[PDB]
Amino acid sequence: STKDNFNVYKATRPYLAHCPDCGEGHSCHSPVALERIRNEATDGTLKIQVSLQIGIKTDDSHDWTKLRYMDNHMPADAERAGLFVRTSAPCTITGTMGHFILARCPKGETLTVGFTDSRKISHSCTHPFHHDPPVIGREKFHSRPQHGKELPCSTYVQSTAATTEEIEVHMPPDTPDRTLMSQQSGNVKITVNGQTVRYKCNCGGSNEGLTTTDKVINNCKVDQCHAAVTNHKKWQYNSPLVPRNAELGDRKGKIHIPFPLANVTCRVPKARNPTVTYGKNQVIMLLYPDHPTLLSYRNMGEEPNYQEEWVMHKKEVVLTVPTEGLEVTWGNNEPYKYWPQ
Amino acid sequence: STKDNFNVYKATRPYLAHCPDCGEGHSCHSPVALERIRNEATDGTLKIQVSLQIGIKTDDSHDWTKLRYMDNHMPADAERAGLFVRTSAPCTITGTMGHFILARCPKGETLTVGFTDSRKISHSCTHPFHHDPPVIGREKFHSRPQHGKELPCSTYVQSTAATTEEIEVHMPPDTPDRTLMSQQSGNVKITVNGQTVRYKCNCGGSNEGLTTTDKVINNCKVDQCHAAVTNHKKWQYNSPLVPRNAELGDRKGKIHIPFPLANVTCRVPKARNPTVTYGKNQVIMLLYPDHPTLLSYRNMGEEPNYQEEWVMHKKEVVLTVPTEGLEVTWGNNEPYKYWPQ
Amino acid sequence: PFGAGRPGQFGDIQSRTPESKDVYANTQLVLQRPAAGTVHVPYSQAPS
Amino acid sequence: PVMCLLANTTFPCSQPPCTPCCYEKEPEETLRMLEDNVMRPGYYQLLQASLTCSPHRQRE
Numbered sequence: 001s002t003k004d005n006f007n008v009y010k011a012t013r014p015y016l017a018h019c020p021d022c023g024e025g026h027s028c029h030s031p032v033a034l035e036r037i038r039n040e041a042t043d044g045t046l047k048i049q050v051s052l053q054i055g056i057k058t059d060d061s062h063d064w065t066k067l068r069y070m071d072n073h074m075p076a077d078a079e080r081a082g083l084f085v086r087t088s089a090p091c092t093i094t095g096t097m098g099h100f101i102l103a104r105c106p107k108g109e110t111l112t113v114g115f116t117d118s119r120k121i122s123h124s125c126t127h128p129f130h131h132d133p134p135v136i137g138r139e140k141f142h143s144r145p146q147h148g149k150e151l152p153c154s155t156y157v158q159s160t161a162a163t164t165e166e167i168e169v170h171m172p173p174d175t176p177d178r179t180l181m182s183q184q185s186g187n188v189k190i191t192v193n194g195q196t197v198r199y200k201c202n203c204g205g206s207n208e209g210l211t212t213t214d215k216v217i218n219n220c221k222v223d224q225c226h227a228a229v230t231n232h233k234k235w236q237y238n239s240p241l242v243p244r245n246a247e248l249g250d251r252k253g254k255i256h257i258p259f260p261l262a263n264v265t266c267r268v269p270k271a272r273n274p275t276v277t278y279g280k281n282q283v284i285m286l287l288y289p290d291h292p293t294l295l296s297y298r299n300m301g302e303e304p305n306y307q308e309e310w311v312m313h314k315k316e317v318v319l320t321v322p323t324e325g326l327e328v329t330w331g332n333n334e335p336y337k338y339w340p341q
Numbered sequence: 342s343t344k345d346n347f348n349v350y351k352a353t354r355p356y357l358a359h360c361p362d363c364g365e366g367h368s369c370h371s372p373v374a375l376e377r378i379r380n381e382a383t384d385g386t387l388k389i390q391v392s393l394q395i396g397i398k399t400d401d402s403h404d405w406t407k408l409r410y411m412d413n414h415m416p417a418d419a420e421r422a423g424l425f426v427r428t429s430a431p432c433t434i435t436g437t438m439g440h441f442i443l444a445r446c447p448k449g450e451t452l453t454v455g456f457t458d459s460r461k462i463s464h465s466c467t468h469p470f471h472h473d474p475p476v477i478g479r480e481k482f483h484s485r486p487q488h489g490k491e492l493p494c495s496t497y498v499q500s501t502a503a504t505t506e507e508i509e510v511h512m513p514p515d516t517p518d519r520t521l522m523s524q525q526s527g528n529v530k531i532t533v534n535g536q537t538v539r540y541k542c543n544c545g546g547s548n549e550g551l552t553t554t555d556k557v558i559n560n561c562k563v564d565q566c567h568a569a570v571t572n573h574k575k576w577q578y579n580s581p582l583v584p585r586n587a588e589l590g591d592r593k594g595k596i597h598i599p600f601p602l603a604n605v606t607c608r609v610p611k612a613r614n615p616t617v618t619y620g621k622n623q624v625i626m627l628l629y630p631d632h633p634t635l636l637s638y639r640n641m642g643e644e645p646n647y648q649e650e651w652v653m654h655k656k657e658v659v660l661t662v663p664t665e666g667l668e669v670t671w672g673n674n675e676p677y678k679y680w681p682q
Numbered sequence: 683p684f685g686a687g688r689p690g691q692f693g694d695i696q697s698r699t700p701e702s703k704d705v706y707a708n709t710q711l712v713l714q715r716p717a718a719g720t721v722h723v724p725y726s727q728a729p730s
Numbered sequence: 731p732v733m734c735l736l737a738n739t740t741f742p743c744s745q746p747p748c749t750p751c752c753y754e755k756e757p758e759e760t761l762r763m764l765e766d767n768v769m770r771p772g773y774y775q776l777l778q779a780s781l782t783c784s785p786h787r788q789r790e
Contacts, residue, residue: 001790002783002788003782005784006781006782143364143467144366144367170765232757232761233757251765253761254768290469488724613728616689629690
């Protein structure tokens with residue numbers, strides 16, 4: 001029994017869609033077209049949606065080392081290792097499943113997703129995207145600590161499971177193909193090749209029809225005709241970069257997606273406690289930050305007079321301690337309280 | 342006769358040591374652990390010390406295309422090509438020999454040293470290090486000129502020879518290994534495998550000892566025992582990231598190191614002479630800098646009134662020339678002198 | 683005016699017509715001594 | 731009991747009449763049926779059953 005073999009990818013397929021920059025600023029019908037970039041995760045993780053499907057082979061089988069993309073009319077297999085994500089510099093890919101990629105990216109103004117096909121030909125899609133993720137906590141750090149202050153943050157979970165979030169899907173539109181038509185001496189010959197072809201000619205007689213068998217259009221030229229293969233057996237993401245199917249109305253399905261956004265915990269480092277010296281209603285701190293650290297302070301009376309500054313390097317701070325008291329917060333550390341003697 | 346085959350690497354070995362960030366902010370026992378970063382060279386060259394040994398194979402033979410690192414209990418060979426150094430972006434490696442790396446790095450806040458092992462697994466170590474080398478001379482330039490003003494500067498010489506500078510070395514501590522102990526039915530079996538093993542059990546009888554042969558601890562559990570392989574045949578850098586040997590006291594040796602700091606000459610470009618126009622006790626200069634250029638001036642009388650400014654782009658400067666005279670220095674050029682008529 | 687252009691400024695090079703064969707130039711072009719054992723033509727000139 | 735729709739009939743979402751291998755047998759018909767139940771609360775029960783293939787000509 002294979003009663004637990006539910007595979008949504010048997011119904012869906014990778015596709016070709018519009019990309020404004022396929023390299024060198026020129027637009028193309030991309031097999032790695034960018035659909036949507038999600039940046040709701042406060043931890044800085046990007047949830048990227050593309051036209052291809054990662055971790056799935058053409059036979060619908062799941063294989064993490066493989067990737068499937070639309071090659072002209074038919075989907076083809078490609079290596080997962082060849083897949084790359086970049087902004088101003090390369091990104092760290094944290095998870096891949098179907099149309100979705102999880103990536104940790106450096107600061108940038110564009111977002112590029114690419115891969116290398118079977119023929120060793122590189123394909124990429126560039127979209128303008130301002131990426132500069134906000135700071136988690138009060139300290140701008142580079143690497144993730146094992147221990148630190150536990151702060152609330154959101155991330156896209158690395159779980160391959162699809163249970164909460166979803167996308168709209170529908171049948172793809174008719175796929176135009178000029179190779180279906182040929183010039184039989186001085187007429188039009190439409191060869192279906194075991195497919196359902198929708199044809200239309202700028203000639204008399206039986207000029208149109210949804211055919212399953214070969215058709216001939218006598219007293220007609222090849223340029224006067226339009227031919228397209230219909231796709232009623234497959235599903236495709238409801239993409240605004242692909243036209244809607246003309247035959248069916250507002251017909252649509254829905255499928256669950258991997259990596260949903262969830263509330264988690266982010267560990268942040270606590271800046272080293274500064275060298276503190278005292279004076280009459282005055283506190284002097286010698287700040288030695290290892291990275292940008294936020295310093296904030298307020299009076300504990302009627303007039304708090306809240307002040308804040310990002311400390312980048314070695315700086316001596318002179319603060320007035322009123323009778324009511326002074327509260328000082330240095331980065332992710334718990335607030336220090338000062339009172340006059 | 343191989344009387345000139347003095348090889349210090351026959352006595353020394355690569356090792357595993359603490360690294361605060363082995364990737365993603367998590368700490369590990371790194372085979373590429375950072376020991377010390379030296380930045381005394383005014384030319385900006387960094388002298389980096391790591392736990393592994395570059396240019397040496399496991400059989401102690403010298404091979405520049407190879408690298409040796411500690412793989413669990415035994416040292417293993419790796420490729421030199423896979424070795425990398427980076428700050429905010431990749432560094433230019435200028436020299437490698439043993440525990441030492443010479444690198445020219447761009448501005449950064451961290452320093453990362455890594456490599457790729459035999460199993461194609463990447464290993465890296467990240468330490469917080471503020472790198473922003475000071476300007477040599479009076480002009481902030483990018484590329485090294487063939488001709489220019491000869492200025493005194495220090496560098497770490499690319500010579501593989503070890504004659505002046507040195508490091509402290511000692512025998513490594515006992516290496517803990519749980520695989521030495523096995524459960525013989527319901528007792529403890531310590532298999533030495535031709536090694537000197539120091540063992541200790543939380544049981545009666547012969548619970549401890551420095552054994553060269555196999556030992557059995559009856560009426561004892563595997564969790565109640567501690568086993569470690571002794572290293573009295575090898576030397577290791579006197580690392581503060583590795584514990585001292587408990588048996589021997591303050592016993593230590595010393596070995597010469599490659600790339601010592603030496604006083605050399607740095608060639609700097611001379612900024613193009615500005616377009617100079619005159620007026621009554623006044624000099625007007627049209628500055629056209631190709632890079633940040635330091636402009637300085639002083640009166641040649643009792644009150645010099647020294648003033649300086651870093652000229653970034655096109656700027657017209659109006660300077661007053663006193664009766665005593667005015668001296669103007671534009672970048673690395675020799676000072677210009679002005680006097681009223 | 684034509685023949686009055688200054689180096690590194692508008693008019694450092696002046697051509698009466700775009701088809702003109704002869705042009706006026708005042709770019710402060712100065713040839714320098716080549717580097718030891720090097721074949722090259724080093725020079726100093728005011729930028730365009 | 732969660733109910734789904736197929737033309738002029740109602741059926742349990744987890745049990746479509748096309749089972750087993752709904753998609754393998756009739757790919758167009760299966761997708762059309764799923765599209766007709768997109769607004770139904772038991773859509774994901776129908777999606778699971780329709781896109782699961784455990785054929786007769788198999789040991790396991």
